[PDB]
Symmetry: C7
Subunit: 205 residues, 7 copies
């Protein structure tokens, strides 16, 4: 049993979470899909040739301070807030679906079977999207090791190419992250609307 | 075969464990959800600009480089929240294991409800395993970047690496607060709904 | 094979010693351990109101823009570890004793009357899951001093980095919370084993029924 | 709620117009392009020894360059990996939005989509490994060239650098074949099953 | 198939059958009483965990640091006990595989009895393989710990670590004697109970 | 239903005809030739050594150090081995794709023809798992033999590092031996299962 | 065509090999190996007698020889490892060519082959680890001897070298046992099921 103020706090949280998820679904998701579609179409993520990304690598070949790649860093400043929201909004929507699961009763509860099927997808997206924050910190750590190795031993030509190839790979990774983040919204937005009857009220009322 | 007096002190454990779980779930869980919803709404975990977070990194392009102040103040509030949720999860998990009746052939749906609720508690436990070690990993990873930046000042990536770990750590605190809020919320939800079958699966 | 009249004496004396142990163990040892560990949780040694009270003196000379003294291990954690180490010893030995008892209670394999066997297999499934947890606790204490020693040694080597001093303090804060989890886990391991065995003891000892 | 159907359907109709045009024109084009690229004398040499880059280390140090004959092939391979991973990722999402409302019983039209979706996931496994291996190649060769110069008295490190090149030539040749086969397999399975993939229920 | 070749193989089956029945009859009962007696000796029942601590002679601002003599004398007794059980397990496993009859259509239950008893033998083989290389890891880890203590004498944790590894290896050697005792006891139990079906699974022909 | 351009559609059908025309000539001519060529290569005295002491690469370190060469006897075998791994991995990938194009429309009825293809395709994955590891095997050998020779030169007093280098050569010889056996068996087993099931692989549903 | 001949000479060569192989080689190898175990080389009464002379001044140091008593056993082990892995691979491939056309239903003759083939995969999983562990031994001993000479004050690195020697000796005893049991189990299961393996339909 719960006393009335306890039941108030949880039910206010449910209606706050419902009020968000309904609004989030209606406005935020279409807007985000349109924004990320346009962001892919911009000339920043449509580099005709990948050689123009090649940052200046100042090392004396037989060392001066070499800053990081500017053309990648500016894209990471736009990507980092776009990763932030999906991880929150997916986690918000996932939590909403968990609270919509009714009491566990006998038989082939098909409304529950639909919820678990939609919930299974939300776990699969959560697998893909969790990797991206560490992959930004990984890039600078891996590039820092490559730039240091190039400076430590300038006679090895591969360590110079390594720093340029990590930049070309990171550019492609960032464009995949935006595409995945666009398609994460689009698939969620589609699958929830299609099954919204059974997700909200699985048994019927 | 058991001695009556030794049996009695095990019955005291179950009674206080049941007396905890009711009073605990009744007040502690709603209160924690309200507090962690408020904590997410505060301006500490709603930094409008991520550029405002980046702490001073003093290395001559050697003076002492401090830890990021604004992350340590948040970690001081987060650490007691991780302690509590993992304690109360472990508490409730144990209560549900003792509610499992004798393993019999007939009348096992009440048991099957407990096993599905117990399945969720292990999945939360799996998520809340990582938060213990996460804080020690951050200072180890950040220190390594600060040391590498000081050891080799010509590499600009190690300077960026330290600021990026601070941005990544801030967001990881943000997700951890949400996860602990949602951990309480989902536990409260499922136990409150299924409380009839969890406490008394067979009936009686 | 008919073995040997004295050979069966070796095994059945072990069987009866294990049956005498497990029955006496279950009745008297488990309730004592659950109450002792509940009392140990209640004690102020595992109820630090502030964790910064545990902070060990980390004496390293901090440099400025113009060798080390002896850095000790955390006293307040080590005293708790010396209390936990015999508790980990006991539960792993008694779990291994009880798991062995249950395996010798498994009857000769028939295709029919196998429900009583299926009860034992479900109880054994839990004992396997406890063995998974408590095997990890033994090497955790070694890993604490290993990781702290690495942090302390390296904080001394690079004293300009402030994160490593904080790291050593955070390992002590993390280790304290970890120890408190282990005492709970070990209390709950005794509590859960006692419950499931006492409830199902009819089918565990005599599965076919007699 | 009903406006939400207009915004989501316009995106589906946009993604349909992209995918259907792309699948008809782009996939046949790419298969002929990559099949021709394999038949070129760049990817077919009579002896693998001609790749062998000049490795100048004083045997008892000067600058050692990368293998030029591999680098020029990597300049042609990198845009091909970029494209196929984007179009596969696009087609994956097109199939996910075609999945109808989840309804009771074993409806076969959905099972066709899941069978085709399993293949797209299996191709996704192969094509993800291609991206990071190019960075891995230069890292491993950079370690080998450094180690060879560090200790010139060992002959194996001299041989290692040549072997990484001759192996990378083989790896680049497979990656072109795999990406050619990825287009061919996707085109074949979607074209055949297009009736059930687009309209599984049939209204 | 050849005449005298058959003789070379069936003598090995006779040798393995004669080994197993004599082994199971006398060796296993003996090993259980001996290993239980080992566990009750005062070497493996140290009343206080401080007494096992070895002298760690390093100057705190290097001289020879010996191995823990109380653990080394225990390892001299444990090593042959590991050797014996790992061999007799591997012998008993092979005997059971040769008792598997021809694979006939459908399901015969006598074969399912063998596969259930065989499943346990492979599960025990997993446990007893870990014991062999863990002794080499103990000395490798203690050597590293002592070397780190000697290289940095200002660090008090490395001193503790070396005493913690000795406390852990004592309590590990404690379990390894119990596990090998329990391996014999469970193997004797399961084979003696099911011997009718293990030896002759299709009944008497 | 999808509409594709008639010239674009003509481009793909030519690739199907290229793969079927290759596979048909490839399966009949190349595979039995390769199996007999590899069986001969195993029988040659290069790959059969009773005495493994002859392999010993003369390791010169003063018990500053002079040049240590690779094992010449292994390197000459690797020059013959590398083009064999090239071909079998390419021809496997050719035939693997030929199965995937032969998979008909996913239908409710008459699915045994499809189950035959999926069983044969299952083997072609298991071979692809084994034949992947042979590619990087050679890179690992010279990398590990180098590290062994470098350690031996760095620390001459340890006699085990000298033995290590000879033991990697003996292992690599017995490895190369095995990898030629596997590639012969890969050609043999593919030829067997494809020839036996060819009716159901090519035309699974029936004839139209 | 004439290419069909090339494969049929290879198949009937493999079928001729497998009958000669199984009929003589496997019985001989089981007896040969079981004799190996009975010899006093692998039956050391006390493990302390294998302890190699570890000469380090308790940094400059003299030559530490490899363990002679383990190396002589490794000279005998290596040719026995070679043989099993080659004959296992020969027999595995023979069984794969014995697999008939994939026909409808669930023909049990095929199911017998698949069960016997499953065992040959499990033995292969066991034996591939034996090959690289000899390289692992000298690599791990070489590092342990180096660490002992580098830092002579550490007593554990001296003990570590003698423990690898005892551990390797015991590992060679098991590798011979496993190789004996690999031939014995293969001979048993193939000979028992030979009717269904050769002609399943």
């Amino acid at each position: 049993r719960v006393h009335p103020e306890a039941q108030a706090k949880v039910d206010v949280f449910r209606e706050d979470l419902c009020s968000k998820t309904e609004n989030l679904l209606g406005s935020y998701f279409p807007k985000k899909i349109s924004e990320l579609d346009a962001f892919l179409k911009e000339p920043a993520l449509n580099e005709a040739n990948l050689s123009n990304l090649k940052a200046p690598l100042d090392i004396p070949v037989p060392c001066g301070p070499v800053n990081c790649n500017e053309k990648i860093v500016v894209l990471l400043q736009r990507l980092k807030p776009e990763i932030k929201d999906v991880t929150e909004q997916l986690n918000l929507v996932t939590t909403w679906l968990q609270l919509q699961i009714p009491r566990i009763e006998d038989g082939n509860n098909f409304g529950v079977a639909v919820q678990e099927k939609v919930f299974e997808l939300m776990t699969n997206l959560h697998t893909k999207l969790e990797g991206f924050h560490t992959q930004i910190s990984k890039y600078f750590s891996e590039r820092g090791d490559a730039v240091a190795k190039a400076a430590k031993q300038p006679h090895v030509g591969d360590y110079r190419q390594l720093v340029h190839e990590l930049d070309e790979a990171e550019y492609q990774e960032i464009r995949l992250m935006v595409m995945e983040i666009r398609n994460a919204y689009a698939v969620l937005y589609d699958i929830i609307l299609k099954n919204f009857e059974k997700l909200k009220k699985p048994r019927g009322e």
